[PDB]
Design an enzyme around this catalytic site. Structure first.
Site, PDB file in Angstrom:
ATOM      1  N   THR A  16      44.852  41.023  37.266  1.00 43.91           N
ATOM      2  CA  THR A  16      45.755  42.022  37.840  1.00 43.91           C
ATOM      3  C   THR A  16      45.966  41.837  39.348  1.00 43.91           C
ATOM      4  OG1 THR A  16      43.929  43.574  38.009  1.00 43.91           O
ATOM      5  CG2 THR A  16      45.328  43.736  36.073  1.00 43.91           C
ATOM      6  N   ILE A  18      46.785  39.755  43.081  1.00 49.49           N
ATOM      7  CA  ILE A  18      48.033  39.173  43.626  1.00 49.49           C
ATOM      8  C   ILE A  18      48.245  37.745  43.191  1.00 49.49           C
ATOM      9  CG2 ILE A  18      47.180  38.460  45.908  1.00 49.49           C
ATOM     10  CD1 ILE A  18      49.707  39.647  47.108  1.00 49.49           C
ATOM     11  N   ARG A  44      38.689  44.808  35.795  1.00 53.40           N
ATOM     12  CA  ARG A  44      37.774  45.941  35.521  1.00 53.40           C
ATOM     13  C   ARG A  44      38.488  47.145  34.937  1.00 53.40           C
ATOM     14  NH1 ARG A  44      36.317  50.381  38.339  1.00 53.40           N
ATOM     15  NH2 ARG A  44      37.505  49.587  40.127  1.00 53.40           N
ATOM     16  N   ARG A  45      39.708  47.408  35.406  1.00 51.64           N
ATOM     17  CA  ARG A  45      40.504  48.551  34.936  1.00 51.64           C
ATOM     18  C   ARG A  45      41.033  48.323  33.514  1.00 51.64           C
ATOM     19  NH1 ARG A  45      44.790  49.579  38.918  1.00 51.64           N
ATOM     20  NH2 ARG A  45      43.538  48.199  40.267  1.00 51.64           N
ATOM     21  N   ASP A  62      33.605  44.767  33.817  1.00 46.94           N
ATOM     22  CA  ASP A  62      33.082  44.834  35.199  1.00 46.94           C
ATOM     23  C   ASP A  62      32.201  43.620  35.431  1.00 46.94           C
ATOM     24  OD1 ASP A  62      31.868  45.310  37.656  1.00 46.94           O
ATOM     25  OD2 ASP A  62      30.989  47.223  37.040  1.00 46.94           O
ATOM     26  N   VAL A  63      32.751  42.622  36.131  1.00 51.08           N
ATOM     27  CA  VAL A  63      32.055  41.338  36.280  1.00 51.08           C
ATOM     28  C   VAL A  63      30.879  41.423  37.249  1.00 51.08           C
ATOM     29  CG1 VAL A  63      34.069  40.067  35.440  1.00 51.08           C
ATOM     30  CG2 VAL A  63      33.568  40.078  37.911  1.00 51.08           C
ATOM     31  N   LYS A 124      40.321  33.027  56.163  1.00 54.11           N
ATOM     32  CA  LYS A 124      39.243  33.673  56.915  1.00 54.11           C
ATOM     33  C   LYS A 124      38.021  32.729  57.084  1.00 54.11           C
ATOM     34  CE  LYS A 124      38.432  37.638  54.532  1.00 54.11           C
ATOM     35  NZ  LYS A 124      37.376  38.539  53.910  1.00 54.11           N
ATOM     36  N   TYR A 151      32.603  33.995  51.468  1.00 57.44           N
ATOM     37  CA  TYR A 151      33.170  32.726  51.038  1.00 57.44           C
ATOM     38  C   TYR A 151      32.114  31.625  51.021  1.00 57.44           C
ATOM     39  CZ  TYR A 151      37.990  34.477  51.976  1.00 57.44           C
ATOM     40  OH  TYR A 151      39.192  35.165  51.937  1.00 57.44           O
ATOM     41  N   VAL A 177      49.136  36.049  51.343  1.00 54.79           N
ATOM     42  CA  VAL A 177      49.893  35.854  50.115  1.00 54.79           C
ATOM     43  C   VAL A 177      51.106  36.773  50.049  1.00 54.79           C
ATOM     44  CG1 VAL A 177      49.839  35.938  47.602  1.00 54.79           C
ATOM     45  CG2 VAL A 177      47.891  35.015  48.834  1.00 54.79           C
ATOM     46  N   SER A 184      46.808  45.050  43.732  1.00 53.51           N
ATOM     47  CA  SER A 184      46.057  44.208  44.670  1.00 53.51           C
ATOM     48  C   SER A 184      45.478  45.094  45.731  1.00 53.51           C
ATOM     49  CB  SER A 184      47.014  43.226  45.316  1.00 53.51           C
ATOM     50  OG  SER A 184      46.385  42.439  46.329  1.00 53.51           O
TER      51      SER A 184
HETATM   52  N1  LIG Z   1      45.787  38.855  49.182  1.00 56.87           N
HETATM   53  C1  LIG Z   1      45.941  37.958  50.157  1.00 56.87           C
HETATM   54  O1  LIG Z   1      46.896  38.007  50.942  1.00 56.87           O
HETATM   55  C2  LIG Z   1      44.902  36.891  50.317  1.00 56.87           C
HETATM   56  C3  LIG Z   1      45.175  35.864  51.218  1.00 56.87           C
HETATM   57  C4  LIG Z   1      44.292  34.813  51.349  1.00 56.87           C
HETATM   58  C5  LIG Z   1      43.122  34.821  50.641  1.00 56.87           C
HETATM   59  N2  LIG Z   1      42.845  35.842  49.799  1.00 56.87           N
HETATM   60  C6  LIG Z   1      41.508  35.849  49.099  1.00 56.87           C
HETATM   61  O2  LIG Z   1      41.712  35.649  47.729  1.00 56.87           O
HETATM   62  C7  LIG Z   1      40.533  36.115  47.026  1.00 56.87           C
HETATM   63  C8  LIG Z   1      40.974  36.930  45.837  1.00 56.87           C
HETATM   64  O3  LIG Z   1      41.624  38.101  46.352  1.00 56.87           O
HETATM   65  P1  LIG Z   1      43.098  38.605  45.979  1.00 56.87           P
HETATM   66  O4  LIG Z   1      43.739  39.131  47.196  1.00 56.87           O
HETATM   67  O5  LIG Z   1      43.796  37.629  45.129  1.00 56.87           O
HETATM   68  O6  LIG Z   1      42.644  39.854  45.079  1.00 56.87           O
HETATM   69  P2  LIG Z   1      43.387  41.196  44.684  1.00 56.87           P
HETATM   70  O7  LIG Z   1      44.883  41.003  44.678  1.00 56.87           O
HETATM   71  O8  LIG Z   1      42.908  42.334  45.531  1.00 56.87           O
HETATM   72  O9  LIG Z   1      42.908  41.341  43.209  1.00 56.87           O
HETATM   73  C9  LIG Z   1      41.500  41.548  42.927  1.00 56.87           C
HETATM   74  C10 LIG Z   1      41.284  41.318  41.457  1.00 56.87           C
HETATM   75  O10 LIG Z   1      39.861  41.321  41.192  1.00 56.87           O
HETATM   76  C11 LIG Z   1      39.602  42.251  40.162  1.00 56.87           C
HETATM   77  N3  LIG Z   1      38.247  42.766  40.317  1.00 56.87           N
HETATM   78  C12 LIG Z   1      37.668  43.340  41.418  1.00 56.87           C
HETATM   79  N4  LIG Z   1      36.450  43.784  41.208  1.00 56.87           N
HETATM   80  C13 LIG Z   1      36.213  43.475  39.878  1.00 56.87           C
HETATM   81  C14 LIG Z   1      35.108  43.693  39.034  1.00 56.87           C
HETATM   82  N5  LIG Z   1      33.973  44.266  39.441  1.00 56.87           N
HETATM   83  N6  LIG Z   1      35.198  43.278  37.752  1.00 56.87           N
HETATM   84  C15 LIG Z   1      36.332  42.684  37.348  1.00 56.87           C
HETATM   85  N7  LIG Z   1      37.439  42.437  38.050  1.00 56.87           N
HETATM   86  C16 LIG Z   1      37.312  42.851  39.316  1.00 56.87           C
HETATM   87  C17 LIG Z   1      40.683  43.290  40.330  1.00 56.87           C
HETATM   88  O11 LIG Z   1      40.798  44.065  39.126  1.00 56.87           O
HETATM   89  P3  LIG Z   1      40.581  45.652  39.141  1.00 56.87           P
HETATM   90  O12 LIG Z   1      41.263  46.346  40.160  1.00 56.87           O
HETATM   91  O13 LIG Z   1      40.621  46.107  37.723  1.00 56.87           O
HETATM   92  O14 LIG Z   1      39.084  45.702  39.535  1.00 56.87           O
HETATM   93  C18 LIG Z   1      41.895  42.388  40.552  1.00 56.87           C
HETATM   94  O15 LIG Z   1      42.304  41.818  39.317  1.00 56.87           O
HETATM   95  C19 LIG Z   1      39.696  36.872  48.069  1.00 56.87           C
HETATM   96  O16 LIG Z   1      38.628  36.044  48.514  1.00 56.87           O
HETATM   97  C20 LIG Z   1      40.708  37.136  49.188  1.00 56.87           C
HETATM   98  O17 LIG Z   1      40.108  37.296  50.467  1.00 56.87           O
HETATM   99  C21 LIG Z   1      43.719  36.847  49.603  1.00 56.87           C
HETATM  100  O1  LIG Z   2      42.975  34.432  54.206  1.00 56.78           O
HETATM  101  C1  LIG Z   2      41.969  35.182  53.929  1.00 56.78           C
HETATM  102  O2  LIG Z   2      40.862  34.760  53.909  1.00 56.78           O
HETATM  103  C2  LIG Z   2      42.250  36.658  53.842  1.00 56.78           C
HETATM  104  O3  LIG Z   2      43.542  36.970  54.337  1.00 56.78           O
HETATM  105  C3  LIG Z   2      43.589  36.911  55.758  1.00 56.78           C
HETATM  106  C4  LIG Z   2      44.877  37.362  56.277  1.00 56.78           C
HETATM  107  O4  LIG Z   2      44.971  36.894  57.618  1.00 56.78           O
HETATM  108  C5  LIG Z   2      44.762  37.895  58.603  1.00 56.78           C
HETATM  109  C6  LIG Z   2      46.054  38.589  58.839  1.00 56.78           C
HETATM  110  O5  LIG Z   2      46.457  39.360  57.720  1.00 56.78           O
END
Ligand SMILES: NC(=O)c1ccc[n+]([C@@H]2O[C@H](COP(=O)([O-])OP(=O)(O)OC[C@H]3O[C@@H](n4cnc5c(N)ncnc54)[C@H](OP(=O)(O)O)[C@@H]3O)[C@@H](O)[C@H]2O)c1
Ligand SMILES: O=C(O)COCCOCCO
Ligand SMILES: NC(=O)c1ccc[n+]([C@@H]2O[C@H](COP(=O)([O-])OP(=O)(O)OC[C@H]3O[C@@H](n4cnc5c(N)ncnc54)[C@H](OP(=O)(O)O)[C@@H]3O)[C@@H](O)[C@H]2O)c1
Ligand SMILES: O=C(O)COCCOCCO
Lengths: 364, 364
Positions: A16, A18, A44-45, A62-63, A124, A151, A177, A184
């Site tokens: 679910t 992003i 988890r949801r 819930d992982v 990050k 990380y 992203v 998300s």
């Molecule tokens: N978003 C960005 O812009 C971005 C940019 C760069 C890097 N990242 C990195 O990418 C990585 C993944 O993040 P994301 O942004 O893609 O995540 P996200 O959009 O916030 O989605 C998180 C996902 O993890 C699930 N989740 C969380 N806790 C859980 C649990 N206990 N059991 C099962 N599922 C669980 C959520 O489901 P539920 O809500 O059901 O729990 C959801 O499917 C992170 O390290 C983040 O820092 C993100």
């Molecule tokens: O890339 C990651 O590890 C998390 O996202 C960072 C976003 O960068 C800061 C400004 O939003």
């Protein structure tokens, strides 16, 4: 009739999310490398209605709970590739590490044809956590900073478990992203669409709340579909195996230009950066708006979302005080991955997509 | 024996230039699109020895002289593609326009199989001349500035002459070029190698003379071989025809990082930007060094070059007070051109190449 045949079987942990939500789409396209794919999607949801209309086998789990995860994932004997695209929603190193270890400990002993683990982290890695950064452009040869970044812990588990079990690995470090999931914890496009929608609802201009530096600097981002493509590439192509890889759209943009486009997309006046003003908190501007959002959802017949779940105003506030964070795609390009997006077009595509899914009101 | 058969016949106008010299190489590679190519190379000076060792038919011609140009180019009945990669060395609009008109008026009536004209201009289209600029990233939809840029005149001739004669056209706007020609009027790599070599000769550090902003900002550039590839793409691929196209390496860099690499490549101490210092003129630092360069050429047995011809210190001074000049490659990528270079590797490759050709001393 007969059991269906697949070439590859994905476990998408965070379906679910992003990026996970984009994997749920890209993995099922006819020309996707490694296809045809079967997709197990974990979150988890309870499965949202929007995801139930996709050909993904949803597993509610819930992982962070080891016994539960063993119970739910150990039966899945056919998995070939793991896509770990999740985090707990805080920077806690041990809870995040536990989630990933639980996936590996449940799957590795049970999936005899397991090939590869994709770990998604982020940029990050190069500049620190949200709780001295490297100079940019960031490259994958830069060493870890001396700070408690989860990380690091995720990578260490990846290397240890894949090495012991003769699996390949990849680490993907996406930029900011651009995507469409309303579930998300960090979705900038949705956050800004929600702000624009609230401004429109209240007959107010789209007022830029950020810093001068973030208005004018070069920035970069990555479409969620491109992250999916990049992860799939590393999962299937031998050239990409056992590599740490950045992922961005291949270009740069400025928030000044995005802001104008956002205002145009919502048919409202723009107030850009005003010389001499300090950044204000968008989280503070929006702190009392939960019931206004509920009213907007009802009036426009949107998919029902809670304001704090669809929007992450705190995350926009970080984006709007950031500069000097550009990452390099040269390593991926040199290894043969030539996927890209036009970031200005990507941003608009994400607005379009969130409108199609009825997460955000249509243009009016 | 028999006359040789070619698929395509290039006229490279400015063959000793920073891009023309790379076309002289790339056009003769076995896998180059449109090959096998015959290459006519035009420039005003007598053919240098370095170019005489290439399979290029050199034509010495002052293309600013209409009668001479008619006399020298009208016999070349087999030309299929023109690559205009020249300028007079000043911003004079009429002398530059005359050179290009003379090429077209001499070739179009005589080359019955002529297909295409490639015009090389540059990113100065977007920000003005050296004698208010657009904001960046620069895209090919940006309108002309209200200033006397010779690029405007060259484009206008291109459109008129190709339209009247049922030819296709392309306009290429390269970023700062990383190349190897010692005959260029604007070769940054050679300029900085010459500076580094003079510093080394005099037992002095590699002192950065530029501005703070140019030390720290994002910058971009293009390898001369990539410009050649891009021009050839537009010459041969129907998708690229009748388009204005930027050309850069696809990434960004900072001069701070280039400077460290330059010092390492020459085995000398670096003095980077010093907080609080204003930019100084590298042209002034080097104004009395003509005889020092002559001595260095003799001592290292280099190809003999005059200091003001191999180096353009004035052009480095412009680069080191520039910021906010990034150009977009999205249009070319969207049309299917996925060529790129790693700019840090490109810079080093150009140093290596100038050393191989004996234009610059080897590492010691
Ligand atoms: N978003 C960005 O812009 C971005 C940019 C760069 C890097 N990242 C990195 O990418 C990585 C993944 O993040 P994301 O942004 O893609 O995540 P996200 O959009 O916030 O989605 C998180 C996902 O993890 C699930 N989740 C969380 N806790 C859980 C649990 N206990 N059991 C099962 N599922 C669980 C959520 O489901 P539920 O809500 O059901 O729990 C959801 O499917 C992170 O390290 C983040 O820092 C993100
Ligand atoms: O890339 C990651 O590890 C998390 O996202 C960072 C976003 O960068 C800061 C400004 O939003
Ligand atoms: N260099 C860069 O970094 C850069 C970057 C972006 C855009 N551009 C643009 O690219 C275009 C081409 O410039 P360039 O830098 O590639 O050129 P260059 O390296 O300075 O080479 C100029 C070429 O033109 C020839 N030429 C000049 N006057 C001539 C004449 N009267 N008759 C015949 N040949 C003549 C020169 O030969 P002789 O010396 O024998 O005359 C040489 O072969 C310009 O519009 C420039 O602004 C350059
Ligand atoms: O691109 C062009 O039209 C000429 O080269 C410009 C170089 O950019 C300024 C800093 O050197």
């Amino acid at each position: 009739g007969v059991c269906k045949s697949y070439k590859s079987v994905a476990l998408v942990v965070g379906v679910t999310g992003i990026v996970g939500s984009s994997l749920a789409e890209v993995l099922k396209l006819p020309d996707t490398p490694g296809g045809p794919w079967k997709v197990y999607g974990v979150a988890r949801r309870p499965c949202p209605v929007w995801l139930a209309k996709k050909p993904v086998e949803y597993i509610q789990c819930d992982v962070s709970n080891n016994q539960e995860t063993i119970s739910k994932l150990s039966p899945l004997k056919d998995i070939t590739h793991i896509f770990y695209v999740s985090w707990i929603g805080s920077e806690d190193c041990q809870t995040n590490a536990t989630m990933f270890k639980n996936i590996l400990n449940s799957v590795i002993p049970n999936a005899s044809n397991l090939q590869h683990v994709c770990l998604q982290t982020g940029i990050k890695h190069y500049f620190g956590i949200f709780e001295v950064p490297h100079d940019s452009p960031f490259t994958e040869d830069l060493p870890r900073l001396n700070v408690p970044n989860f990380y690091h812990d995720l990578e260490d588990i990846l290397y240890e478990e894949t090495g012991k079990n003769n699996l390949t690995w990849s680490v993907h470090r996406p930029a900011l992203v651009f995507g469409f999931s309303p579930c998300s914890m960090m979705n900038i496009v949705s956050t800004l669409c929600v702000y624009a929608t609230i401004c429109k609802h209240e007959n107010k201009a789209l007022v830029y709340p950020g810093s001068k530096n973030s208005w004018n600097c070069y920035a970069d981002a990555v479409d969620a579909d491109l992250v999916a493509e990049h992860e799939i590439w590393a999962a299937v192509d031998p050239k990409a195996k056992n590599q740490v890889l950045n992922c961005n759209n291949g270009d740069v943009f400025k928030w000044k230009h995005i802001w104008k486009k956002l205002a145009e997309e919502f048919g409202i006046e723009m107030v850009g950066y005003v010389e001499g003003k300090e950044q204000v908190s968008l989280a503070e501007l929006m702190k009392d708006k939960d019931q206004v959002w509920d009213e907007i959802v009802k009036k426009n017949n949107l998919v029902p979302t809670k304001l704090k779940e669809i929007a992450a105003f705190w995350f926009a506030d970080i984006a709007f005080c950031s500069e000097n964070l550009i990452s390099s795609m040269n390593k991926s390009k040199e290894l043969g991955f030539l996927g890209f997006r036009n970031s200005m077009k990507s941003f608009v595509s994400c607005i379009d997509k969130m409108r199609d899914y009825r997460f955000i009101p249509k243009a009016f």
